[PDB]
Amino acid sequence: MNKVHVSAVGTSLLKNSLSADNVKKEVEDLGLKDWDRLKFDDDRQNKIRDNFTTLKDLLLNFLKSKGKEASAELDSLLSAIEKLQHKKEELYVFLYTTNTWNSKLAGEVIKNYLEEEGIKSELATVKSISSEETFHEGIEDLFDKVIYKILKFKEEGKEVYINATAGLKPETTFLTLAGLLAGADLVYYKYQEFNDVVFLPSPPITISPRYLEWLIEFANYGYTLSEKKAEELGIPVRLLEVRNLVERKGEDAYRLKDWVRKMLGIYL
Amino acid sequence: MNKVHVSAVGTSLLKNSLSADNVKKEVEDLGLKDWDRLKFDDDRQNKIRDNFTTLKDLLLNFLKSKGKEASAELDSLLSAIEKLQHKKEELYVFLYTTNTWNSKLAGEVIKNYLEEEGIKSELATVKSISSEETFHEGIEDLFDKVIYKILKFKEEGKEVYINATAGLKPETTFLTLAGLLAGADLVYYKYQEFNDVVFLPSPPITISPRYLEWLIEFANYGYTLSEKKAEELGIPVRLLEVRNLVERKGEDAYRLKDWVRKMLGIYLG
């Protein structure tokens, strides 16, 4: 499993499944008209979870019937697999879901259809998902997770590939950004009407040395202090939390991020 | 300009317009069923351009009727304007279209509706737009363009804001990347079901200094190389600088990119 593909999950499966006669009528029954595009904290979202198993089994049938094209995730993923001739025994897939039932719905179906096709997969959820003042914290968190993963698998000697096709815009923007930073092998994308997948350009991108110099000596100073003696050799730590490089959590607010610490170590 | 907003334009307007009874039937008449989602080099795309004025006038009516919500671009843009209370007088808005008739159709309608609302706007077209082996060159080109605007207005002392909402995924990803690099004030995004726009987090990001130091030394020798002096200070031009930093390279000569030349100047040299 030395070929890992990371992807977001969206609601493509939901929206494409309203083509199926059986699905449109069963969904229309539960009153789930626009179930692919609803507010993250919508009443219709609870409808999806109490019927979750009912809907999960319906979409498996639609996904087996339609194949690749039923969903953005599977369409782009399997286009890329055949393009790059990846073996299923040497293959691993990471699906990130959001904290919404339509996203976990699509995630669960895609995970099942992959393991049925003979492809190992793993689900995951950025729990920090709603709009009001949490959405920015959510993409912050998903960025922190993906970038750590990419370094971890890259240390083992995995070939990491990034499916930037599916999920919300910011979700996909950060998945390519983290890939560029953590040195992923490829970032691919496939538009609905493309024949096969296309590879995005990769600029050589790093954390700005202005902040990076203070991160070097952050670890050396026992990391976390007060105000003056925390800025004791020139560490603006509130500035560091604003640029999402350090975490506060409590009173003092001195917690070097787990990816940041690991990325400094790759000056060898 | 005193608060500049750059955006991509997609086929949101086209897709949302098939709600209108007049639009659905007139579009269905021209056989433009899925006109929001067609291959960039599709026959249906020519259908759009010979009826362009007919369709341009139809969508103006729909856009005046619906307002903001008729398109992603206008919905996210005007949500941001009211959020950040930009006085209409000082606004300038930069819409990039792709090289497809549906996109320029959307663009033209949006340009007209903005100038009618009292907002200065300007169209643009990334001409290198098709799938086969041109799409990566096209987003390379859009990235080259949108980098420049950010540097220009930021040097003048005007603020700059990026609408990462609209257009294809790569188009929006590189619009935010450029913003992050060239030091734009904000990058905002609005999901179709959000109340108003949300501001994306900002890691402090630049081009890695290991490549940056090789790019400074390329500049000093007037660009366009092949061999012998191809690794004179440690510059692999068809290998490491084939990561989109050098143009052509494998055919004719190996020249450096017009954005990277201007970016070495903007980072103090």
Ligand SMILES: Nc1ncnc2c1ncn2[C@@H]1O[C@H](CO)[C@@H](OP(=O)(O)OC[C@@H]2O[C@H](n3cnc4c(N)ncnc43)[C@H]3OP(=O)(O)O[C@H]32)[C@H]1O
């Ligand atoms: N008036 C407007 N008309 C049309 N679009 C508008 C308008 N105002 C704003 N927009 C937004 O503008 C972007 C242009 O398309 C859209 O944001 P985008 O990131 O593209 O979201 C679209 C899809 O939402 C899906 N997905 C919705 N929930 C979730 C969710 N909770 N987890 C993951 N994916 C989700 C994503 O997965 P997928 O493969 O099907 O594509 C995306 C629109 O939501």
Ligand SMILES: Nc1ncnc2c1ncn2[C@@H]1O[C@H](CO)[C@@H](OP(=O)(O)OC[C@@H]2O[C@H](n3cnc4c(N)ncnc43)[C@H]3OP(=O)(O)O[C@H]32)[C@H]1O
């Ligand atoms: N089996 C599949 N089912 C569903 N979606 C699939 C599938 N395989 C791939 N996808 C893609 O995955 C994303 C959603 O799952 C989509 O790609 P995305 O880049 O998000 O397309 C989004 C919209 O394309 C539109 N726009 C189509 N033309 C053009 C064009 N020529 N200039 C600009 N924008 C264009 C834009 O309108 P806007 O404001 O609402 O947002 C974009 C789909 O094309």
